[PDB]
Design a protein around this nucleic acid. Sequence first.
DNA 1: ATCAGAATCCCGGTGCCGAGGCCGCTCAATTGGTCGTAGACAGCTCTAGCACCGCTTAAACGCACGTACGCGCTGTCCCCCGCGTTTTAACCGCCAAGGGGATTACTCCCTAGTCTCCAGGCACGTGTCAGATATATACATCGAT
DNA 2: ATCGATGTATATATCTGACACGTGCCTGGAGACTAGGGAGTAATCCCCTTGGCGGTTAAAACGCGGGGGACAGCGCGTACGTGCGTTTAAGCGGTGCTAGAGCTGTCTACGACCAATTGAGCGGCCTCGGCACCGGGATTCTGAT
Lengths: 95, 97, 82, 80, 97, 98, 106, 109
Amino acid sequence: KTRKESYAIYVYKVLKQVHPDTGISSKAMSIMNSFVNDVFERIAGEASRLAHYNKRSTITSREIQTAVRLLLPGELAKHAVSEGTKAVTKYTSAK
Amino acid sequence: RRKTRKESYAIYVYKVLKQVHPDTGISSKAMSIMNSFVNDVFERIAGEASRLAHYNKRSTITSREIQTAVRLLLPGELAKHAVSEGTKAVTKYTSAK
Amino acid sequence: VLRDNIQGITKPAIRRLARRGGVKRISGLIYEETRGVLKVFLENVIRDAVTYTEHAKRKTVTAMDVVYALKRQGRTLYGFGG
Amino acid sequence: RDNIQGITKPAIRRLARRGGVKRISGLIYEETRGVLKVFLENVIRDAVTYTEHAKRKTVTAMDVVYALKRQGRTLYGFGG
Amino acid sequence: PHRYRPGTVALREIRRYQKSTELLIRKLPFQRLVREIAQDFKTDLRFQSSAVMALQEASEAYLVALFEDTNLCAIHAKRVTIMPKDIQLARRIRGER
Amino acid sequence: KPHRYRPGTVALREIRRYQKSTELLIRKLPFQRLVREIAQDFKTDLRFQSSAVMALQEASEAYLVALFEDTNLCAIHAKRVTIMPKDIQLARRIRGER
Amino acid sequence: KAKTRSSRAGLQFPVGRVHRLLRKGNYAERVGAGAPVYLAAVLEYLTAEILELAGNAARDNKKTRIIPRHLQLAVRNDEELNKLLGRVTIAQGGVLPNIQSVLLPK
Amino acid sequence: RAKAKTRSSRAGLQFPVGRVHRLLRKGNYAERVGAGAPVYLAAVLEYLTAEILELAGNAARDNKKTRIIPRHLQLAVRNDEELNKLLGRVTIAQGGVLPNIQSVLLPKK
DNA sequence: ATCAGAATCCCGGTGCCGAGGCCGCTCAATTGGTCGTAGACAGCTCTAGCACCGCTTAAACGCACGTACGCGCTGTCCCCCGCGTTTTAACCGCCAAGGGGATTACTCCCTAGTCTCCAGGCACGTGTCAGATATATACATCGAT
DNA sequence: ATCGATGTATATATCTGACACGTGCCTGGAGACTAGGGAGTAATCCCCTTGGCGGTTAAAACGCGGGGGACAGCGCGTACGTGCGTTTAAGCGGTGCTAGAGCTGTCTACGACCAATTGAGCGGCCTCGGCACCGGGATTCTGAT
């Protein structure tokens, strides 16, 4: 179909949250979108391998957490893991 | 109890060995290396065919995808001969039941 | 049939590529060596991209084909699609 | 502890001989112990990650093979 | 007249091209080279402009990183000029040669 | 005078001997103690399968041997024979490990 | 009235799209409920880190618009993201302004 | 009911077409798997096994042995260029290295 | 060239233990049938890739010249090799214990699947402002004296 | 130092196209309900990991002499950097057209699924021959003469 799927709007929302005066070029937009896609593919492939190694048939928060601890460097992994459990906690509390 | 089944390519590697070298044997560690090699190349070709099917918005892994994954991963003489063997096998298999 | 287009990667182009790499002084055979290296790299990436193209039954090498070719060798490239 | 010194100077010399090295400086031994400690730390950290995910308390060979596979160096003959 | 000391125009070029972002290979000869290389794999091919641009970006990045490693291993030999043996050493250590 | 080989002959003989063979060149109990010491930092009270330590040792020795090959190559590149730590650092930097 | 899952989790990234991509991307036959939430939070963090350092880089070059050069500076100047994107090429990103000390004039 | 015939026998292969098919279906590679895909994959795996095993048997003969050990697989792989390319990032346990001394290190007259 | 000595290679004998083969079993592949759906093919649209012409101008190119750097040679000294002697701890074997890894059984809750709806996100459109370009200029740095 | 050349940064003004916002729509995501099966948990068992003792021997540690290799200094010559005039083609802008990417519709072949069958493949047991260990003579190779 004519539509294409991208993370433009979400990246912009994060950018406005961080630096609420700065724009982003279209080339830099394409780079950020491909970066999000590449990191998603890495984490998802590692979680798939993780679920396959332990004879599991489901990707859960535990497999995503372990895949983050595997690929992300330690400071990035630590802060992303703590926030991710905070986000999962917020989602379960609100249901 | 009885140990649960652990499948390996040991007997198939041994059959291929008796075909190419009818009198040569193989140790257990070399058999484990061949099993690891078959599993590794299998997961490489299967992941490449999976990515190929995902890139073209398709949902079936066919002989086309496996052939293209062999052309991608395997070096050119090896790819050319592996493609010849795979093509020959798919034709002879389709000719029969 | 295009021919002798490897010399189109001129000597000043290689010197600019070296300057961006931090190279202060360049020999005289570095140009031919770099043309050979670039030819090998381009051959590998273009072979992988033309394989990706032929799989899709297209005749036009898409930029996404080049991106997938680069990803296959581990030389992931951002800015032409994900 | 003293365990990194357990990778003795003759062992590092033997590893260099297998690598084809004819003459070895005296500081290669400490440099090699540091290199080995970092490679081991990366592989073992990833293997213990794979172990903790499996809710195990022992580090299996398979986990080491997986950690190596993630590093991009693939080991044959230990399973997989 | 006035002439610069051999090596400072080179450092000026280093600073200029490390501060800059343009492509350092002319686009039309590189595109012709891409066409010439691709005619062997399949005849009567076509290239998106973005495909040739991505190829050029990858080629320039690869050559610049190779020249960084070449420079490092030329300084390692207590030299400043980079020789072809420096490129050969860098590629052999990287695992491509 | 007792016979002494010229400096570098026994080194070449060792090169041929250890390139001809396949045993592990690091003693197994020191390497095992090192592995457990390193793993003590990621999780306390860990245990190891024997084959896990064996796989770690095979990988470590192959990595170090390939590193010493690259180190020797870049030492010969500098018109030298002795390998220095700067040779190791060059090999690791070109290999994208630094 | 339907409340979106991103607002429930408190994220800007789409939990629904991440769940759909996990389900269609052939990673497992099932996908847990917390997995897209966790993945969206991690992706949002990496985006926020890259964009924060790129905005700082853009301020350093006195610009108010992130271009690929600022993303390259953000990536290659930080160590953790340089480890993360060590095998990654950024188009129009250029290189770090680094000159070797031996080549500097005497 | 017709007598059972293995898919590998139909394809003229030794490697298991049915097991490769089950692994492709359970491996989470695609929602569907073609009929000739496990046939093609088993043929490719059998060919690569035949290549390494032939070269390893040659290496085992050269060392006057009749069993293939990891050393023979390592010699077979690293002595062939194309397989060394395919297994470049691969370390073979108990495989050793190739006998190779740089010519600068050899003695002189 | 020679020769002695140290190390390795080879040849034969003995043993031993792991590879090869056989057998019971069990569960995973095969066969036969059904059904939904996906992809093969036809056909239509319309985008963009290729081809071309012309003008401009900035980059490439050829050459002259000087000089900095690569490279070869020489001397020195230091520090690594190689070998003899002492020490130590790795390894092998043997035994004991226990803890945790793998297995099975039961349950329940968590996720796929379907439906219904509706709002968010994504082509199209637009306008306006950040950055590109141009120009003058100031300024710091390089160089010869 | 110093001043002159000289490239490069900096400050300002015009423009411009690309980015930031609005709109309409439509299709993908959310609420709700269902089944069913995968995962959580609990008990069990056994194997395989950890710990200890002893000897014994090969390897590690240490000392020492010396030689050869790292490294610093020096000379030279040549190859490369810099600059300048010429020429060459890359670039840009407009215009053409047609091949082919991309989308839609239809339908049929093909793969998921499911039940019954059974034979291939795996675990276990046993044995014998390939290989390994030992020892001793032969050959190679190295270094001093």
